[PDB]
Design an enzyme around this catalytic site. Structure first.
Site, PDB file in Angstrom:
ATOM      1  N   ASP A 109     -12.272   8.804  -8.281  1.00  0.00           N
ATOM      2  CA  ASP A 109     -13.538   9.340  -7.816  1.00  0.00           C
ATOM      3  C   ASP A 109     -13.388  10.626  -7.035  1.00  0.00           C
ATOM      4  OD1 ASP A 109     -12.617   8.458  -5.368  1.00  0.00           O
ATOM      5  OD2 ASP A 109     -14.171   6.947  -5.064  1.00  0.00           O
ATOM      6  N   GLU A 124       0.825  -1.203   0.000  1.00  0.00           N
ATOM      7  CA  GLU A 124       0.000   0.000   0.000  1.00  0.00           C
ATOM      8  C   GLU A 124       0.863   1.258   0.000  1.00  0.00           C
ATOM      9  OE1 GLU A 124      -2.977   0.347  -0.665  1.00  0.00           O
ATOM     10  OE2 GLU A 124      -3.951  -1.606  -0.301  1.00  0.00           O
ATOM     11  N   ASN A 130      -9.013   5.261   2.912  1.00  0.00           N
ATOM     12  CA  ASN A 130      -9.697   6.104   1.920  1.00  0.00           C
ATOM     13  C   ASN A 130     -10.689   7.076   2.588  1.00  0.00           C
ATOM     14  OD1 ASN A 130     -11.275   6.969  -0.332  1.00  0.00           O
ATOM     15  ND2 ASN A 130     -11.300   4.991  -1.287  1.00  0.00           N
ATOM     16  N   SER A 149     -11.775  10.893  -4.045  1.00  0.00           N
ATOM     17  CA  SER A 149     -11.291  10.538  -2.728  1.00  0.00           C
ATOM     18  C   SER A 149      -9.778  10.393  -2.766  1.00  0.00           C
ATOM     19  CB  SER A 149     -11.947   9.258  -2.245  1.00  0.00           C
ATOM     20  OG  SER A 149     -11.535   8.128  -2.975  1.00  0.00           O
ATOM     21  N   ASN A 201      -7.629   9.065  -5.786  1.00  0.00           N
ATOM     22  CA  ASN A 201      -8.419   8.112  -6.530  1.00  0.00           C
ATOM     23  C   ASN A 201      -9.237   8.831  -7.590  1.00  0.00           C
ATOM     24  OD1 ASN A 201      -7.642   6.011  -4.696  1.00  0.00           O
ATOM     25  ND2 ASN A 201      -9.076   6.822  -3.190  1.00  0.00           N
ATOM     26  N   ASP A 210      -6.397   8.281  -0.601  1.00  0.00           N
ATOM     27  CA  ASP A 210      -5.934   7.260   0.303  1.00  0.00           C
ATOM     28  C   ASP A 210      -4.845   7.931   1.148  1.00  0.00           C
ATOM     29  OD1 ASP A 210      -7.580   5.284  -0.562  1.00  0.00           O
ATOM     30  OD2 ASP A 210      -6.027   4.094  -1.557  1.00  0.00           O
TER      31      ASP A 210
END
Ligand SMILES: [Cl-]
Ligand SMILES: [Cl-]
Ligand SMILES: [Cl-]
Ligand SMILES: [Cl-]
Ligand SMILES: [Cl-]
Ligand code: NA
EC number: 3.2.1.17
Length: 129
Positions: free
Chosen positions: A48, A35, A59, A50, A46, A52
């Site tokens: 969309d 990660e 998220n 959002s 991301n 992380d």
């Protein structure tokens, strides 16, 4: 902070992640490796909108507040910046909520695609724990 492998294993264990929800410590270390490469300050946007955050790439769509993810929730009740600290407490406590949420560690795409089913004990091999 960029943790070493055994250093992160030790911190995760101190914070109660070893065998949490049945996931051995090597699962958690492997997830963090893929990660964030063990970097607490990692952030990634991301598609969309959002983002992380942190060593486990948690998220803002569901778990933390960053002020710029419309319609999102903040189920860990924390600013997303808390997930970037050199102290992993906030990321661990939020991860505990996530992994309890129904799909286990499948919530972490890197875990499912790169850790699940593999020899995850290699991630703690040799560590003084
Ligand atoms: Cl490594
Ligand atoms: Cl393990
Ligand atoms: Cl928001
Ligand atoms: Cl820590
Ligand atoms: Cl499970
Ligand atoms: Na949010």
């Amino acid at each position: 902070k960029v943790f070493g492998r055994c250093e992160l294993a030790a911190a995760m264990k101190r914070h109660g992640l070893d065998n949490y929800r049945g996931y051995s410590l090597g699962n958690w270390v492997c997830a963090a490796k893929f990660e964030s490469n063990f970097n607490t300050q990692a952030t990634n946007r991301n598609t969309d909108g959002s983002t992380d955050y942190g060593i486990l790439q948690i998220n803002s769509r569901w778990w933390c507040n960053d002020g710029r993810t419309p319609g999102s929730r903040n189920l860990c009740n924390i600013p997303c910046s808390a997930l970037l600290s050199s102290d992993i407490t906030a990321s661990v406590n939020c991860a505990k909520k996530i992994v309890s949420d129904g799909n286990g560690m499948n919530a972490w795409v890197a875990w499912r695609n790169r850790c699940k089913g593999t020899d995850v004990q290699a991630w703690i091999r040799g560590c003084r724990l």
